[PDB]
Here is the input.
Amino acid sequence: SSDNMQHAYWELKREMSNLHLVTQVQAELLRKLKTS
Amino acid sequence: SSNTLVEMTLGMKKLKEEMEGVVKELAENNHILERFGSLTMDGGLR
Here is the structure.
């Protein structure tokens, strides 16, 4: 119904948070790599 | 607009699944970097 659209929307926003996080982990990782 | 709305719901479902796939691949890239990566003045594409 209208409810299932709200649920799909919520899950989509939820996944965006996971995308922000893995990107921030990658940023941190680049900062922490060995250099030479 | 129930025909356009059903496709919006399914569209949002598909986007979520695609995003999941990207997150998984970015995490795999991160794992490679965590184990083997370095930054060097003369690293890069050689």
Q: What stands out?
A: Chain A has one domain: 1-30. The interface with chain B takes residues 4-5, 8-9, 11-12, 15-16, 18-19, 22-23, 25-26, 29-30, 33-36 of chain A (CB under 8 Å).
